[PDB]
Amino acid sequence: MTVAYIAIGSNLASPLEQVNAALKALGDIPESHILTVSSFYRTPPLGPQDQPDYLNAAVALETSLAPEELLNHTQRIELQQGRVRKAERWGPRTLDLDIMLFGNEVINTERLTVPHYDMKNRGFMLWPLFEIAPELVFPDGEMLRQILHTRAFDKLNKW
Ligand SMILES: Nc1ncnc2c1ncn2[C@@H]1O[C@H](COP(=O)(O)CP(=O)(O)OP(=O)(O)O)[C@@H](O)[C@H]1O
Ligand SMILES: Nc1nc2[nH]c(SCC(=O)c3ccccc3)nc2c(=O)[nH]1
Ligand SMILES: [Ca+2]
Ligand SMILES: [Ca+2]
Ligand SMILES: [Cl-]
Ligand SMILES: [Cl-]
Ligand SMILES: [Cl-]
Ligand SMILES: [Cl-]
Numbered sequence: 001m002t003v004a005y006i007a008i009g010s011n012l013a014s015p016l017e018q019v020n021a022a023l024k025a026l027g028d029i030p031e032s033h034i035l036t037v038s039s040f041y042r043t044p045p046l047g048p049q050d051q052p053d054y055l056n057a058a059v060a061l062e063t064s065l066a067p068e069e070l071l072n073h074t075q076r077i078e079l080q081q082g083r084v085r086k087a088e089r090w091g092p093r094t095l096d097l098d099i100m101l102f103g104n105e106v107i108n109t110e111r112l113t114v115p116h117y118d119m120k121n122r123g124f125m126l127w128p129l130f131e132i133a134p135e136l137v138f139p140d141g142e143m144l145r146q147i148l149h150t151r152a153f154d155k156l157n158k159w
Contacts, residue, residue, distance in 0.1 A: 001062050002103040003035065004070055005133065007116070007125045008057045009096040011045070015055035016159065018081055018095050023059070025077040026097075029070070032063040038128035040159035046122065047090035055159050058100070058128035067102045071112050074099065100125060104139040115139060123153030 006026070010018040019040060027034050038058040045051050063070055074097040081095045100116045107114040115138060119125045126148060129136065136144040 001064050002105070004061045004063055004067075004099060004103070005101040005129060005136075006059045006061055006074065007096075007098040007100050007119070007128075008059065009054050009098075009124070010094060011052045011054045012092045012094045013082065015052075016040070019055050019057060021081060022077055022095055022097065025080070026059060026061060026074075029061070029063070029065070029073045031065050032061055032070070032073075035060040035062050036132040038131045041124065041128060041156040042159045043124040043156060046124070048088065051092040054124065056124040056128060056156070058125070058132055060132050067099070067105060067107055067114060068109065068112055070102070071099060098125075100129065101136075101138070106139050120147055121151075123156065126153065127156045 008019055008022055023037060036059065041056045043054045043056045045054060078095050078097055083093055083095055098116050099112070099114055100119050102114045105114060116125070126144065130144055130148055134145065138144070
């Protein structure tokens with residue numbers, strides 16, 4: 001069994017409802033169990049800013065699925081909650097499920113890059129992760145606590 005960490009974001013169609021629904025759906029993924037859920041945070045948008053604030057959270061999920069099988073299931077949940085690909089890059093969405101980490105595995109396949117390529121630069125990922133896994137060490141040996149102690153990130157406000 002491997003512990004995966006998933007980032008959850010939503011800024012459309014009642015984010016609290018979307019995130020609660022996503023948590024129920026995550027609990028229904030085969031060969032998997034939710035270990036921990038962070039608080040929910042109301043975060044200003046990074047990238048394009050002409051969109052609503054996000055609800056961001058993190059979840060720890062224990063699984064015996066292959067990493068790409070986990071991805072299959074997270075994509076299914078996004079699609080079933082009305083996620084649609086649009087023209088604009090990094091636009092608003094009903095639900096975004098990013099696989100941040102899959103144990104200490106390092107993956108670059110066509111569908112899947114883990115660790116998430118930009119998570120070490122995103123407070124809305126790192127703070128909820130720290131809440132649920134304060135002792136976390138990345139596959140490259142970097143400590144989550146050290147990143148947050150060293151780098152400027154705004155603290156998050158609760159949803
Ligand atoms: N760690 C990961 N978690 C989820 N999807 C991933 C991933 N690594 C690669 N992907 C791929 O990313 C593709 C596009 O996903 P999108 O959700 O549109 C990018 P985004 O989340 O809006 O931006 P971001 O990656 O900068 O956070 C998916 O079809 C999936 O195959
Ligand atoms: N508060 C917030 N902003 C986001 N922005 C995106 S997509 C773009 C993005 O994260 C980025 C970060 C740095 C530079 C350019 C784009 N997802 C989220 C999210 O879940 N939360
Ligand atoms: Ca994302
Ligand atoms: Ca995504
Ligand atoms: Cl809401
Ligand atoms: Cl959407
Ligand atoms: Cl940030
Ligand atoms: Cl790493």
